[PDB]
């Protein structure tokens with residue numbers, strides 16, 4: 001019954017994770033957009049002392065999001081939130097019940113967070129070389145069940161964790177967003193269209209076809225525009241190696 | 242009934258996490274050391290294609306650890322293993338039952354993994370300045386309950402995740418091991434002994450006092466000697482400014 005408020009922004013794949021999970025859970029919840037990159041509200045550190053989105057409040061009296069209550073629990077870090085929503089809504093089966101299959105979900109989230117996420121971050125924001133990102137994506141793709149299905153078989157929070165980032169890659173590449181070189185943009189677009197990455201393309205289509213994605217996605221062109229408001233995605237800067 | 246084998250190495254904090262959790266769970270399990278850094282066994286990629294420790298096998302027929310069975314589940318990534326052990330041993334209460342307290346545990350693991358671990362890596366393996374690491378440690382200390390207790394109050398896998406890294410810091414500093422300068426080594430030793438870091442010292446003492454730590458620790462001097470075998474810790478080498 002306790003209220004959930006998620007502080008969010010359209011561009012953010014980290015925040016997107018949690019919106020997907022809340023939709024899959026069937027939760028009642030409130031979202032509130034926060035201009036974290038240009039004009040952080042003075043009250044925002046009350047909901048997240050790290051000053052990052054997503055931020056979540058849970059419980060406490062029902063209050064406007066821009067007047068957060070000291071009585072609400074303040075939850076930070078998107079993966080903690082995913083596990084939290086799975087704990088709050090056990091009937092939604094946001095994780096398998098079998099411990100080995102639950103471990104496949106946790107492993108997949110850790111493979112993404114530890115080996116892929118940092119490569120997306122560095123290729124897009126620093127223009128580092130794309131080959132180690134493609135290698136990491138090939139590794140992640142190898143963790144998927146070969147025949148189809150999601151990271152742990154049935155849909156789970158592991159797929160909420162990963163699809164925001166993978167789903168952004170294709171339209172960001174097409175719009176030329178990111179500090180990588182022309183040569184690496186070509187390299188990545190060809191690779192992600194190649195037979196080498198057929199399995200992850202089907203995974204992306206399968207995650208995107210779910211209502212939890214459709215109802216938390218502004219559309220490809222609108223997300224690209226959101227992303228162009230990010231200062232670190234400086235138009236006109238590219239790095240070469 | 243299903244066997245647990247953990248592929249480990251004394252020096253490794255990541256492997257140490259999983260040993261602590263298996264002790265806390267009261268599990269029956271086998272450990273098998275792997276010389277991952279100098280002489281990887283040609284069979285090891287069958288238990289973990291990433292070629293990293295820790296690696297875990299679960300179930301299948303009882304076999305010698307250097308003859309892994311294709312029938313065992315192969316589990317990778319230390320934090321996935323920690324959640325797995327909690328799932329396997331629910332009566333050992335390795336996570337809280339309360340959703341919010343559980344989220345404190347998951348948040349604390351994410352704070353360490355996202356903001357602290359990379360600072361330990363940079364200072365110890367690259368000799369980058371120590372200040373950002375001290376700052377990250379102060380943030381992580383701020384997440385602890387100020388009056389006492391573990392990350393989520395009661396002991397949880399969150400404390401298994403973090404104590405292997407914190408516990409190595411003091412003996413490694415005392416041994417001058419790591420690529421940071423003597424100046425930054427003194428700076429860090431002084432900082433970690435000051436009242437600024439009293440709370441995280443109490444945290445390290447409280448975690449270390451548990452049998453799960455004693456039974457998985459070689460002793461400070463022995464752990465330093467294991468760490469000196471790590472090529473990337475470059476014993477005898479320090480960067481300056």
Ligand SMILES: N[C@@H](CCC(=O)N[C@@H](CSc1ccc([N+](=O)[O-])cc1[N+](=O)[O-])C(=O)NCC(=O)O)C(=O)O
Nearest residue numbers: 014036051052053054077078079121125230232355
């Ligand atoms: N580990 C956290 C990560 C959350 C995070 O990074 N949030 C952002 C998204 S924006 C973002 C996030 C990552 C990177 N990046 O370069 O890695 C760049 C940007 N950006 O906006 O330029 C933020 O709010 N930053 C505000 C701040 O730190 O003051 C989680 O999982 O929830």
Ligand SMILES: N[C@@H](CCC(=O)N[C@@H](CSc1ccc([N+](=O)[O-])cc1[N+](=O)[O-])C(=O)NCC(=O)O)C(=O)O
Nearest residue numbers: 114255277278292293294295318319320362366473
């Ligand atoms: N995310 C994984 C991380 C596991 C990991 O990094 N394991 C190591 C420990 S050694 C290690 C781990 C991290 C760093 N580091 O530079 O950060 C340096 C070293 N090292 O031995 O020099 C390993 O086996 N590496 C072998 C390989 O990659 O082929 C987990 O949580 O289990």
Ligand SMILES: [Ca+2]
Nearest residue numbers: 141142143144
């Ligand atoms: Ca595979």
